[PDB]
Amino acid sequence: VDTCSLASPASVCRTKHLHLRCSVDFTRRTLTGTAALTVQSQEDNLRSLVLDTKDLTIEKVVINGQEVKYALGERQSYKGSPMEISLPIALSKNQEIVIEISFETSPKSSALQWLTPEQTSGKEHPYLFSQCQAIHCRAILPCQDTPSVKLTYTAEVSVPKELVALMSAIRDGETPDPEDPSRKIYKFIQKVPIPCYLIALVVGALESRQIGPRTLVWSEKEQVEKSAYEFSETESMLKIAEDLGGPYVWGQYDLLVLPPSFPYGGMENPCLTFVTPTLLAGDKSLSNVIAHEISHSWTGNLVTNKTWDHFWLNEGHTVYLERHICGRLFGEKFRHFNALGGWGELQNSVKTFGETHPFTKLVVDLTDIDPDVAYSSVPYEKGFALLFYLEQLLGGPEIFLGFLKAYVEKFSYKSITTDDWKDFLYSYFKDKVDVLNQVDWNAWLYSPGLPPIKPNYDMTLTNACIALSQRWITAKEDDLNSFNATDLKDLSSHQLNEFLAQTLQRAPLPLGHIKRMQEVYNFNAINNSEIRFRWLRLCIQSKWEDAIPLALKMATEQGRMKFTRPLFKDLAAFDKSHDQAVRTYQEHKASMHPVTAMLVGKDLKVD
Ligand SMILES: CC(C)C[C@H](NC(=O)[C@@H](O)[C@H](N)Cc1ccccc1)C(=O)O
Ligand SMILES: Fc1ccc2[nH]ccc2c1
Ligand SMILES: [Yb+3]
Ligand SMILES: [Yb+3]
Ligand SMILES: [Yb+3]
Ligand SMILES: [Zn+2]
Numbered sequence: 001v002d003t004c005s006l007a008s009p010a011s012v013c014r015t016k017h018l019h020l021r022c023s024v025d026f027t028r029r030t031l032t033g034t035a036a037l038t039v040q041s042q043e044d045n046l047r048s049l050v051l052d053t054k055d056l057t058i059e060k061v062v063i064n065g066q067e068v069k070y071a072l073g074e075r076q077s078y079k080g081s082p083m084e085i086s087l088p089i090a091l092s093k094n095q096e097i098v099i100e101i102s103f104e105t106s107p108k109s110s111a112l113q114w115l116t117p118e119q120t121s122g123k124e125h126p127y128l129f130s131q132c133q134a135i136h137c138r139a140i141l142p143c144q145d146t147p148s149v150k151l152t153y154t155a156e157v158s159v160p161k162e163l164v165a166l167m168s169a170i171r172d173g174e175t176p177d178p179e180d181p182s183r184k185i186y187k188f189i190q191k192v193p194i195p196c197y198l199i200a201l202v203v204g205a206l207e208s209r210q211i212g213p214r215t216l217v218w219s220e221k222e223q224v225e226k227s228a229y230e231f232s233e234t235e236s237m238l239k240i241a242e243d244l245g246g247p248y249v250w251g252q253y254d255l256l257v258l259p260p261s262f263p264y265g266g267m268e269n270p271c272l273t274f275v276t277p278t279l280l281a282g283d284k285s286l287s288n289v290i291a292h293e294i295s296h297s298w299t300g301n302l303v304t305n306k307t308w309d310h311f312w313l314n315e316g317h318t319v320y321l322e323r324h325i326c327g328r329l330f331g332e333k334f335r336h337f338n339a340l341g342g343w344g345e346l347q348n349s350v351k352t353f354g355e356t357h358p359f360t361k362l363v364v365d366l367t368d369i370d371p372d373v374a375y376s377s378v379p380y381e382k383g384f385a386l387l388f389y390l391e392q393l394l395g396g397p398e399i400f401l402g403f404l405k406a407y408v409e410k411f412s413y414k415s416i417t418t419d420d421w422k423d424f425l426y427s428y429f430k431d432k433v434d435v436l437n438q439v440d441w442n443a444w445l446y447s448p449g450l451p452p453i454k455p456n457y458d459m460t461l462t463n464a465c466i467a468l469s470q471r472w473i474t475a476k477e478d479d480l481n482s483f484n485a486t487d488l489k490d491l492s493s494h495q496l497n498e499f500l501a502q503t504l505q506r507a508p509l510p511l512g513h514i515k516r517m518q519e520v521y522n523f524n525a526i527n528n529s530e531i532r533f534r535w536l537r538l539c540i541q542s543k544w545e546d547a548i549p550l551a552l553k554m555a556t557e558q559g560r561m562k563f564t565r566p567l568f569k570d571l572a573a574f575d576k577s578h579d580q581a582v583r584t585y586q587e588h589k590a591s592m593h594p595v596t597a598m599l600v601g602k603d604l605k606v607d
Contacts, residue, residue: 002307003367004135006073006082007144008050013041015144016096018153018196023183024203026126026160029107029114035141036100041091048087052138052145054080055106062100063088078370080138101142111136113261113593120204120259121220125163127204129258129274131595133267134308134371137196148306148415150193158183159203166218168200168269170251190270192249193413195304200269202256211255214238219257223277227257230280230287233329237291240325244401245298245408253294260558263593265289268296268318276560278529285493285528288326288338295321303411308371310418312362316383317404323384324401336458337494339388343457344501346381347450353378355449362386362445363418372595373602382451386444389455390425393435403428418445465495469502472513480516488521493528500534507541514542524550533563540570540577548577556588559596569603582606 001009015037022033039049053072061070069086076082091097107114115127130140138145157165158177161184169190177183208216209228212235217227234255242248254272257280266289267274273293279286299317319342327335350360358364359374362382366374391400406428411420422441429436443452468487475483488496503509518524523535536554539547548571555567571581585604589597601607 002146002148003365004079004308004371005052005144005146006050006076006079007052007146009146010042010144010148012043013039013046013049013144014149015151015196016040016193017151018141018143018155018199020141020153020155020157022155023158024128024160024165026114026128029112030104031112031140032104034100034102035143036098037143038096038098040096041093044093046087046091049085051083051085051142052080052135053083053103053142054136054139055109056139056142057104057106058083058142059102059104061085061102063097078372079135083142103142105140108594109136109139110594110598111139115204115259115261116591119261119591121222122205125205127202127259129202129204129262130200131263131267131274131593132199133197134311135197136595137199140199140201143196145196146307147195147197147304150195150304150413150415152193153188153190153199155188157186157188157201157203159186160184162205163203164206165201165203166206166254166256166272167202168194168198168272170271192270194270194301195415198268198270198301200267200272200274202258202274206256208254211235212238214251215253215255217255217257218272219277220259223257223280226280226282227255230282230284231255231275231290233284233287234290234294236329237287237294237325240328241291241294241297241321244321244324244405245295245302246405248297249302250297253297255290260560261593261596263559263561263596265560265562266293268293268300270297270301276558278558278560278563281493281528283493283528286530288322291325291329292318292322295325298408302413303408304415306415306417306420308366309364310416311364311371312379312383313416313418313421315380316387317407319380319384320387320404324397333458333460337461337498339384339455340457340459340462341498341501342377342381342384343454344498344505345377346385348505349377349381350450352376357448360448372599385451385455389451389453390439392455393439394429394432461495462498464491465498465502468499469506472503472517473506473509475513477512480512483516483520485520485522493531496526497528497531497534500531500538504534504538504541507538509538509542511542511544514539514544529558529560529563533567537566537570540567540574543574543576545576548574548580551577552580552584556584559593561596561599564596565600565603568600572604 017038019036022031060067068088071084073082111130117123117126120127135145159165165186167188169188172187172189174184174186177185206218207221207224208218209224210216211228215234219227250270252271256274257277260277262276265276295318300314305313323335323338353360360378440452526532536551540551551567555564571577
């Protein structure tokens with residue numbers, strides 16, 4: 001039972017297919033069109049069904065070529081409004097009908113961001129992109145908005161002719177729009193069943209460049225070159241993921257680089273991963289994001305969480321595979337470094353929420369909770385730490401990967417729960433159940449706070465970071481002299497980043513120390529977004545006025561939530577920048593991604 005959806009559940013009826021015909025209108029910021037749902041009943045004598053919608057204008061509903069009765073219930077907050085459709089003929093178990101719904105979206109659709117030409121790189125054309133995870137697909141089209149249901153889809157999308165549409169599907173040709181030659185129709189087929197949260201659309205002045213046998217990179221013209229370089233390891237990453245998870249079943253693996261307001265680092269949309277332009281460090285150092293989204297092609301897009309309570313199944317297994325790809329690519333010691341980093345993110349989230357907070361549970365009860373509000377690292381890193389702890393318990397990586405590969409074959413095309421997962425883990429390791437019964441399942445799966453056990457981590461690459469961070473924290477004024485640019489001589493970008501994360505955990509440091517840090521390390525010059533983000537944070541919590549404009553600038557010139565939210569929060573907690581933070585939010589709010597807008601608003605205690 002999915003408590004984030006208002007639709008009839010999978011035990012009642014199941015959508016098999018969506019055919020979407022729609023037109024994008026930049027002048028009105030609406031999508032207008034029809035969604036044809038092929039719906040299979042799961043019960044005897046079914047006479048009505050319920051769909052999720054949110055800020056949708058329904059014009060009519062047609063079955064067998066006749067307008068039919070339907071109604072929108074009362075809005076229930078972030079869930080939207082349930083649509084009740086009256087079937088003209090009762091259906092028997094397993095019967096299929098096609099239900100064609102005529103709809104239009106609101107400009108305020110929580111799924112969409114409409115960009116003005118000034119908000120893009122080229123400056124001549126507007127741009128639109130979607131983000132359906134978790135429950136925003138209902139703000140684009142009426143659907144059973146729950147991952148407990150999987151459907152194939154095809155779409156035809158009319159856009160101004162000088163623009164391009166792409167979707168989470170195989171692109172299947174373009175032509176002039178016969179209803180209006182100022183426009184093109186682009187067509188798309190997704191032949192592999194998916195949860196609706198993987199539906200995705202972009203429309204904009206895009207070009208593509210080929211970067212491997214089954215990958216094109218797409219973005220505005222002025223990002224293409226740098227993007228092809230930055231993501232050049234992509235094919236080699238697919239080769240390792242195939243080896244780990246089994247065949248890649250989706251045809252194409254493309255990348256779309258979005259404008260800087262894209263709320264996430266990456267979003268694993270089938271055939272077309274979306275990434276933030278803040279990944280473009282110049283040196284491929286941030287590619288673990290591509291490896292993570294690649295991994296979802298098995299864990300997440302094949303095997304899917306039945307409800308969002310079980311999100312950890314999605315993210316935990318994926319981070320587990322991301323870290324393996326990275327370990328194959330760069331060595332096992334690098335996997336251990338990144339894993340220990342992750343536990344560090346875990347300590348931070350739990351500290352922030354508080355150790356008894358319900359959102360620190362691996363499995364969460366989402367009734368009444370907006371998933372955008374509950375989102376944190378907890379399901380990623382607590383989930384990852386569970387799998388890493390099981391790996392050490394059951395005899396190392398190669399053994400645990402045999403389970404991962406078998407778990408994917410097993411649940412491919414399905415949606416599963418935490419108990420579905422646990423059960424198969426007991427079945428697969430039947431010769432080791434005695435070891436499995438020493439795991440504190442109730443603590444790991446259902447208790448708040450840090451996990452009860454911390455796995456074993458190689459420290460090789462981590463030591464230099466902890467050591468340099470300890471020198472700075474224990475330094476007094478008379479020790480500042482002895483820091484030099486040569487302290488950084490042997491640290492990769494990743495270790496510089498880990499150095500700052502260590503140091504930020506003990507923030508604030510004295511203002512003197514920070515000034516000296518900039519003097520000898522020149523962190524202000526570093527354009528790597530992870531590093532600059534933590535270095536700006538450390539600056540603002542240590543109350544260094546000069547960092548105020550640098551922080552405001554980063555928080556607004558890009559909008560990846562990971563960076564934008566804690567930058568605004570920090571700035572607001574600093575008395576000197578409090579007013580400017582609140583003012584800047586209010587000045588930028590209207591042209592922000594609507595989900596980012598809402599969360600930053602909450603965080604700042606505004607409106
Ligand atoms: C390496 C990963 C941790 C990168 C991470 N991206 C992800 O986790 C994606 O796979 C997630 N699917 C992003 C997401 C989750 C929930 C709701 C909306 C969007 C991100 O930072 O965006
Ligand atoms: F959107 C989501 C989904 C699953 C989750 N599990 C813990 C937080 C959380 C947020
Ligand atoms: Yb075709
Ligand atoms: Yb069992
Ligand atoms: Yb001293
Ligand atoms: Zn993910």
